[model samples]
Target: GVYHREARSGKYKLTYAEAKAVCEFEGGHLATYKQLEAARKIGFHVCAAGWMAKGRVGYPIVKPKTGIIDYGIRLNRSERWDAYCYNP
Candidate 1:
């Protein structure tokens, strides 16, 4: 399953490196875009953005709750956000 987790400091405060580490600390790896999308297809949705593999970040929203899955890369890699972890 894919689980969304916040940092020790709090939610929306995890940098890319921090997120990558956070998932591992939790006995899982940072989730990838496809992994998250697959989960979302199965009815998994969270009202928060998160870091995914290979510098991608987004949140899943089933039933068209909003605009889109906001995934991309930017110069602001130091930006903070929650993280998605996968262990399956």
Candidate 2:
């Protein structure tokens, strides 16, 4: 399946509920791990932290000595940050 994605970042930091609402409001939903993977495969990289599905918190590193992206970082749901959304 083909999907459109956006890793929007700015000064706005939101909690899980807020992020979900924004994504849904934008005509999309919170990005799943699979969706994030697909986005990464297509060169979708962002430096800002964001919430992913399953309560996973992560960010994409464009260039790193570790050569890794989506480190699978986890955070408390109450934490606020940007988010990655998946749009069909």
Candidate 3:
């Protein structure tokens, strides 16, 4: 079973790093490649972006309704972002 983090209302929220740390301390580490792959296979979309393997570790966290910046890493399409694409 899996659960998501929810924030009702708060101006002071933890960043991705902080949140990840908390989860790690609680026995769950940050989202991993296996998790993402399983999600994609299950047709579940994500928005929790991360910095690894060319900025494709996670998706950009967004608001469900308005698609706002709920949390997670904010990356731009550049050399770093290209790492996720297929390689020949």
Candidate 4:
């Protein structure tokens, strides 16, 4: 299992390409839903929406909004947003 982190370097928004590059540069890759779930199970909670693998936008909700933590919402790939990276 790998860990995930919200890539923030003075900014939180990034395009899909930029996000992918950053994760690769950091010796990891964009986190998948399974990876994200693993992270969440280990207490990696975040409110910021971010790009995940498979062209979906999601975020972890520590607080109860709809009795769910991982929201599987979709967004335009070209849009700028934060990302969760899988770190092995």
Best by TM-score: 1
Q: By TM-score, is 1 or 2 better?
A: 1
**What are the TM-scores, per candidate, against the unseen true structure?**
0.88, 0.73, 0.37, 0.75
Candidates ranked by lDDT, best first?
1, 4, 2, 3
All predictions: root-mean-square deviation over Cα? 1.7, 3.9, 10.0, 2.9
lDDT of 1 by residue, 1-88 (tens): 8989988788799999999998898888998788888898888889888888886888999876643277686458899998999988
Tens-digit per-residue lDDT, 20-69, candidate 2: 77778888888887777676667766766677777666665446532225
Pairs with backbone N, CA or C atoms under 3 Å apart (clashes), candidate 3: 47-59, 47-60, 47-61, 48-59, 49-59
Clashing pairs in 2: none
Error of 3 at 49 (Å): 5.8
Candidate 3, residue 65: lDDT: 36
Ranking by TM-score: 1, 4, 2, 3
Residue 46 local lDDT, model 4:
70
Model 4 pairs whose backbones collide: 14-81
Look at candidate 4 and tell me the lDDT of residue 10.
41
Please identify model 2 stretches exceeding 4 Å from their true place: 1-12, 65-75
Q: Least accurate stretch of 10 residues (summed lDDT) in model 4? A: 66-75
Estimate the lDDT of model 1.
0.84
The digit string of per-residue lDDT tens for model 3 on 60-79 reads 32235322222234454331
